Structure formats: structure tokens, C-alpha cells
Amino acid sequence: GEIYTETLQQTYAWTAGTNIPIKIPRNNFIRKIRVQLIGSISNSGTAAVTLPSAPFPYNLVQTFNLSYEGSKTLYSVSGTGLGILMYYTTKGQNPAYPAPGTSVPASGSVNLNVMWEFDLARFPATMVQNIILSILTGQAPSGVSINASFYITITYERVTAQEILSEGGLGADGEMPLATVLPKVIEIPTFNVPASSAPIHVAYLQPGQIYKRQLVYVINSTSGINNTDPTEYELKIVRGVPTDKIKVSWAALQAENQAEYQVAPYSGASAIIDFRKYFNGDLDLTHAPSDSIEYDLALQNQDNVYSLYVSYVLPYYDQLAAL
């Protein structure tokens, strides 16, 4: 149907360590939600303050949680992970002011403008209840104060009953359209991954979803996300005859991202795995067994690993299989 965008009148002030539940209006089907943290950062001290390195300013939001009907989760990601995903998907153009390392003059301030977007495919919002975007804010960088608010912008699509019938109608339970694709973007951490020259097991991909791409970044206790500890990435099938599906160096992966996203790496410790580039289409594990596919890393130092999965699920997967 007709696609249009509008910005909610109600804004939400940024305060440290605060969980901000935002109700999303169900005016029509929703294709996406945009969040912009806009305002300023001030320094009332006597010396100029150098703002922190990456993942600032994205870590000014600790976590984003998008859910409906109380228990159904569309997104569960940190402000950092979603921000890095924005960096790549926007060819590094995503608004992220001020840049890491920016200086805030004594008795001065700098402009703040950070953006994040949630792709909801074409969510049948008019058919569900209580869509809530929860923003758990992060902490203020040392030596400064944050003076800003979150602006919410929604992209809708007016989907008529006629279009729905034309696209197969509703699914068996009559809850949503048959052709519904539900995003399932979840960030999963893995702490204390030991240094290794050969890739070691980080985690298994859970079945029940279709994997499109995986964003992986690593944190070093000294240099944070600005490190070059990862050297190799491996996606291996462990169930049955052990078989690697992906075995690449971090540099080669980042080179692939460069071509794909037309932008240099967010840092030496971040990379994206577009599964369709290694499988015929996306990695569909809807009915796959558990603990069958793992992703492994070779790290120069023992670090904490973060994996943000850009996946989706078909609520009526089976029915659609008919064709």
C-alpha cells in the first residue's frame, strides 16, 4: 500500500540509567521505526574534555527493546550493536554526532545527533496489541552532562483488506496476514573467549529463525572495541560430519564488507557475515536441530564477544511451504 512517514509529537528526555517505555501507535502497518537522540553535551569543568572513543556515541543508549503483546520480541539489542549495524548499512553515513574523541571545551558544549532505525519488514501493527519500544539509557561520559531528547519517527504502510486477500489473506489462526515476515533481531554476548591462533567455539546459532546477517564485534579490556584481536572467523556445521561453511580471516571478512557496504570497518574488531554469500539464500534454521551450527573466532587476546543477529521468522512458515 501507500508508504508514509510521521514523527511522534511526544519526545523523551535523556536521563542516565533510565528505562524509557515508548508506546508505538498502530495507525497502520509499520515498515520501520526511527529513533534520534538529539541535543547537546556540555562541559562545566575547568579543562576541555576529550569525549571517549567508539562505541561512543552509540553507547549513550544501553539497550533497545522492541516488543508487542507483552511477550513478543522483535528487537533486543544494545545501543552499541544496533549503532554499528547502522554504520555499515548506511555506508558510514549514519548521523552519529559528536564523533568519538571530540573535545568539549571548558564551559562549552557540542552538538549531539545519533540515529538508529528498526526495520520491521511490514508489521501488521493494526492487528496486534501494545507495541512498546523500550529505551534503557546508558551513562553520561565522565566530565560532561547530556542535554537531549529522543525523537521517534514511524514509517507506515496503508495496507487494505483487499491487498491482504490478494496476498493470500490471513494465516491459519487468523491473527496476522499469511505473508507476514517478522524480524527477530537479537544480540547475544559470549564472555571470556580465550586467545587462540585457531578458531574456537563461541556459540551455537539457535534454530527457529532464518539468519540473514551476523554482526560480530569484540571488546578488549584495555583498548575496548578499538583493537585488532580477531584474526579468523569460522561458521561450522557440527551435527553429523563436521563441515566448515565459512572459514575466513578477519581482514578478508572486512574486505568483503568494504565491497558490500562501501565503507571501511567500524573498527579492527567488527565485521558482518552476510550468510547468503556462503549459502544459497539466507540461512534457514526454522526447523533445524539445536546445537548444529556454531560460529568460532581466533583472538589475539581473551575478550568478550558480541553477536547481533539480523534474523526473521515466518509465523505461518509451514502453510507457505505448500507452494
From TrEMBL:
<dbReference type="GO" id="GO:0019028">
    <property type="term" value="C:viral capsid"/>
</dbReference>
<keyword id="KW-0946">Virion</keyword>
<protein>
    <submittedName>
        <fullName>Coat protein</fullName>
    </submittedName>
</protein>
<dbReference type="InterPro" id="IPR055085">
    <property type="entry name" value="Major_capsid_jelly-roll"/>
</dbReference>
<keyword id="KW-0167">Capsid protein</keyword>
<dbReference type="Pfam" id="PF22405">
    <property type="entry name" value="STIV-like_capsid"/>
</dbReference>
<feature type="domain" description="Major capsid protein jelly-roll">
    <location>
        <begin position="189"/>
        <end position="323"/>
    </location>
</feature>
